[PDB]
Design a protein around this motif. Structure first.
Motif, PDB file in Angstrom:
ATOM      1  N   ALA A  55       0.849  -1.187   0.000  1.00  7.30           N
ATOM      2  CA  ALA A  55       0.000   0.000   0.000  1.00  7.30           C
ATOM      3  C   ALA A  55       0.894   1.250   0.000  1.00  7.30           C
ATOM      4  N   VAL A  56       0.867   2.003  -1.110  1.00  6.34           N
ATOM      5  CA  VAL A  56       1.580   3.278  -1.234  1.00  6.34           C
ATOM      6  C   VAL A  56       0.844   4.359  -0.396  1.00  6.34           C
ATOM      7  N   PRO A  57       1.564   5.180   0.440  1.00  2.89           N
ATOM      8  CA  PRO A  57       0.973   6.355   1.137  1.00  2.89           C
ATOM      9  C   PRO A  57       0.603   7.474   0.134  1.00  2.89           C
ATOM     10  N   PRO A  58      -0.341   8.401   0.489  1.00  6.03           N
ATOM     11  CA  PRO A  58      -0.735   9.499  -0.412  1.00  6.03           C
ATOM     12  C   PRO A  58       0.427  10.491  -0.664  1.00  6.03           C
ATOM     13  N   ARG A  59       0.584  10.850  -1.943  1.00  2.00           N
ATOM     14  CA  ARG A  59       1.610  11.764  -2.461  1.00  2.00           C
ATOM     15  C   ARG A  59       3.040  11.369  -2.053  1.00  2.00           C
ATOM     16  N   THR A  60       3.472  10.208  -2.565  1.00  2.00           N
ATOM     17  CA  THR A  60       4.837   9.682  -2.359  1.00  2.00           C
ATOM     18  C   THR A  60       5.819  10.205  -3.432  1.00  2.00           C
ATOM     19  N   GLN A  61       7.051  10.559  -2.998  1.00  2.00           N
ATOM     20  CA  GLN A  61       8.168  10.938  -3.893  1.00  2.00           C
ATOM     21  C   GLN A  61       9.183   9.786  -3.988  1.00  2.00           C
ATOM     22  N   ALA A  62       9.975   9.816  -5.062  1.00  2.00           N
ATOM     23  CA  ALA A  62      10.978   8.779  -5.373  1.00  2.00           C
ATOM     24  C   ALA A  62      12.309   9.060  -4.673  1.00  2.00           C
ATOM     25  N   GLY A  63      13.063   7.987  -4.396  1.00  2.00           N
ATOM     26  CA  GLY A  63      14.267   8.067  -3.553  1.00  2.00           C
ATOM     27  C   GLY A  63      14.063   7.381  -2.212  1.00  2.00           C
ATOM     28  N   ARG A  64      12.784   7.112  -1.882  1.00  2.00           N
ATOM     29  CA  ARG A  64      12.389   6.208  -0.784  1.00  2.00           C
ATOM     30  C   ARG A  64      12.731   4.749  -1.160  1.00  2.00           C
ATOM     31  N   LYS A  65      12.443   3.796  -0.247  1.00  2.00           N
ATOM     32  CA  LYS A  65      12.558   2.352  -0.551  1.00  2.00           C
ATOM     33  C   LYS A  65      11.843   1.529   0.535  1.00  2.00           C
ATOM     34  N   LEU A  66      11.408   0.296   0.199  1.00  2.00           N
ATOM     35  CA  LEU A  66      10.888  -0.650   1.213  1.00  2.00           C
ATOM     36  C   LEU A  66      12.053  -1.401   1.859  1.00  2.00           C
ATOM     37  N   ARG A  67      11.877  -1.723   3.146  1.00  2.00           N
ATOM     38  CA  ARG A  67      12.734  -2.650   3.885  1.00  2.00           C
ATOM     39  C   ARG A  67      11.892  -3.882   4.254  1.00  2.00           C
ATOM     40  N   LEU A  68      12.158  -5.007   3.572  1.00  2.00           N
ATOM     41  CA  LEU A  68      11.348  -6.233   3.702  1.00  2.00           C
ATOM     42  C   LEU A  68      12.181  -7.377   4.279  1.00  2.00           C
ATOM     43  N   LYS A  69      11.770  -7.871   5.445  1.00  2.00           N
ATOM     44  CA  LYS A  69      12.502  -8.925   6.164  1.00  2.00           C
ATOM     45  C   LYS A  69      11.954 -10.301   5.783  1.00  2.00           C
ATOM     46  N   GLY A  70      12.869 -11.175   5.342  1.00  2.00           N
ATOM     47  CA  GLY A  70      12.521 -12.522   4.863  1.00  2.00           C
ATOM     48  C   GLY A  70      12.119 -12.547   3.392  1.00  2.00           C
ATOM     49  N   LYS A  71      12.389 -11.434   2.678  1.00  2.00           N
ATOM     50  CA  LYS A  71      12.055 -11.277   1.245  1.00  2.00           C
ATOM     51  C   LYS A  71      13.322 -11.172   0.381  1.00  2.00           C
ATOM     52  N   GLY A  72      14.503 -11.166   1.042  1.00  2.00           N
ATOM     53  CA  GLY A  72      15.787 -11.366   0.360  1.00  2.00           C
ATOM     54  C   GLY A  72      16.038 -12.848   0.120  1.00  2.00           C
ATOM     55  N   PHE A  73      17.207 -13.192  -0.449  1.00  2.00           N
ATOM     56  CA  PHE A  73      17.505 -14.565  -0.902  1.00  2.00           C
ATOM     57  C   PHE A  73      17.385 -15.613   0.237  1.00  2.00           C
ATOM     58  N   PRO A  74      16.843 -16.839  -0.079  1.00  2.00           N
ATOM     59  CA  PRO A  74      16.837 -17.965   0.859  1.00  2.00           C
ATOM     60  C   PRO A  74      18.262 -18.497   1.071  1.00  2.00           C
ATOM     61  N   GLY A  75      18.594 -18.712   2.334  1.00  2.00           N
ATOM     62  CA  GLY A  75      19.917 -19.156   2.759  1.00  2.00           C
ATOM     63  C   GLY A  75      19.856 -20.268   3.797  1.00  2.00           C
TER      64      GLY A  75
END
Length: 89
Positions: A55-75
């Motif tokens: 879900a994107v917040p209202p009036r978002t600008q670029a240069g932000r990023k998501l931090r997602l835990k357990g969504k990087g490579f399986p190890g």
């Protein structure tokens, strides 16, 4: 975990844990069009096996990023984290 396939943005939703650092990590792109960015809808995030949708917040600008835990490579120690740079296109 929450019903959403994504955690937080960077404070938006909830200030879960402001800390960018880990291992088994991935760098991706969040493709947010200018309409969905302004109104605050949803967009897809590229992941390992399939897609995430945040879900994107209202009036978002670029240069932000998501931090997602357990969504990087399986190890052998579990999984890593996924930092994906928001683009407003």
């Amino acid at each position: 975990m929450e019903t959403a396939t994504a955690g937080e943005w960077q404070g938006k939703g909830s200030g879960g844990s402001g800390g960018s650092g880990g291992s088994q990590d991935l760098y991706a792109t969040l493709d947010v069009p200018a309409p969905i960015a302004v109104v605050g809808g949803k967009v897809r995030a590229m992941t390992l096996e399939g897609p995430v949708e945040v879900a994107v917040p209202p009036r978002t600008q670029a240069g932000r990023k998501l931090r997602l835990k357990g969504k990087g490579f399986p190890g052998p120690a579990g999984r890593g984290d996924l930092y994906l740079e928001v683009r407003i296109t």
